[PDB]
Design a protein around this ligand. Structure first.
Ligand SMILES: OC[C@H]1O[C@@H](O)[C@H](O)[C@@H](O)[C@@H]1O
Ligand SMILES: O[C@H]1[C@H](O)[C@@H](O)[C@H](O)[C@@H](O)[C@H]1O
Length: 291
């Protein structure tokens, strides 16, 4: 006898392709569960997102799912939500806290390890690596890159990170950094490990403009977007990883709405991302989108 409850989904931006997909799944899911949904867009600003989260309370949200712009800057706003006793969870990103709300999404640390293991297996006697990292204060970056670094370190000094730069998750930055640094290295690196697809796709454009062919420098990504899957299929990109946004979003909304409607526990969801190479593209959530 219950429908049209207001749920807010606070995203840090709607400019990056992963965030755009999270919004898509959320709107679809909202219709299936017969809830009202507002997807708030932080515009890559912590100040805006904090304000968005204040508005979520004023607007009478019955549940709030938050993907924080920043590990620390959003914490006060999340604390206000908790004090108001509004059912809440994080998704994708997190905030640093001693009593976190439930979280929905892939284990980024494990994902980072898994990407590193695949690189090491491709270069078992070592490699020179360019590492492109995400928005520094995003927990998705922090955890994923820690996994990558720790697992490369466990492989030993034969894995050498010769460039280590943030691209803030942006395609344009992957392009700029790779076009800028490749000419300055006395030896061609073996691998470019990108913390996401967007920067890896920009790296690929850079390599293409430098006159290189697919596979001359290995490139890894993360997010399993259709464009990235197309580049895995044609060999420009060695791997991506599926952190299963349809599962994360649908499960987060189902559990939050279940708490609203029936007082069911919000348990969260933790799982490893699935590494996607050329031989297993059909395991990606969005395989049907590859023309
Ligand atoms: O007021 C109509 C609303 O009904 C809800 O059950 C739907 O989930 C919304 O998508 C819609 O806007
Ligand atoms: O904002 C970022 C960005 O969209 C990355 O591409 C994605 O891998 C991260 O999970 C997300 O937090």
């Amino acid at each position: 006898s219950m429908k049209d409850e207001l749920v807010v989904f606070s995203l840090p931006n709607l400019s990056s392709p992963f965030e755009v997909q999270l919004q898509k799944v959320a709107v679809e899911t909202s219709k299936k569960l017969e809830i009202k949904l507002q997807v708030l867009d932080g515009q890559s600003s912590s100040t805006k997102q904090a304000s968005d989260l204040e508005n979520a309370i004023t607007r009478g949200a019955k549940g709030i799912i938050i993907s924080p712009n920043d590990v620390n800057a959003i914490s006060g706003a999340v604390e206000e939500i908790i004090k108001e006793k509004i059912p809440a969870a994080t998704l994708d990103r997190k905030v640093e806290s001693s009593k976190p709300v439930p979280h929905f999404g892939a284990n980024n640390y494990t994902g980072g390890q898994e990407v590193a293991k695949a690189v090491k297996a491709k270069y078992p006697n070592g490699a020179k690596i360019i590492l492109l990292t995400g928005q520094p204060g995003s927990t998705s970056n922090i955890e994923r890159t820690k996994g990558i670094r720790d697992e490369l370190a466990a492989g030993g000094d034969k894995y050498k990170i010769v460039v280590d730069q943030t691209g803030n998750w942006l395609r344009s930055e992957g392009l700029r950094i790779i076009e800028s640094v490749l000419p300055t290295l006395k030896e061609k690196p073996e691998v470019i490990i990108s913390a996401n697809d967007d920067m890896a796709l920009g790296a690929i454009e850079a390599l293409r403009s430098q006159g290189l062919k697919a596979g001359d420098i290995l490139v890894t990504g993360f997010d399993s977007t259709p464009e990235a899957l197309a580049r895995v299929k044609d060999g420009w990109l060695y791997l991506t990883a599926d952190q299963r946004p349809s599962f994360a979003v649908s499960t987060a909304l189902e559990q939050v709405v279940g708490n609203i409607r029936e007082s069911k526990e919000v348990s969260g969801a933790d799982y490893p991302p699935k590494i996607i190479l050329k031989d297993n593209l059909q395991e990606a959530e969005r395989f049907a989108e590859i023309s």
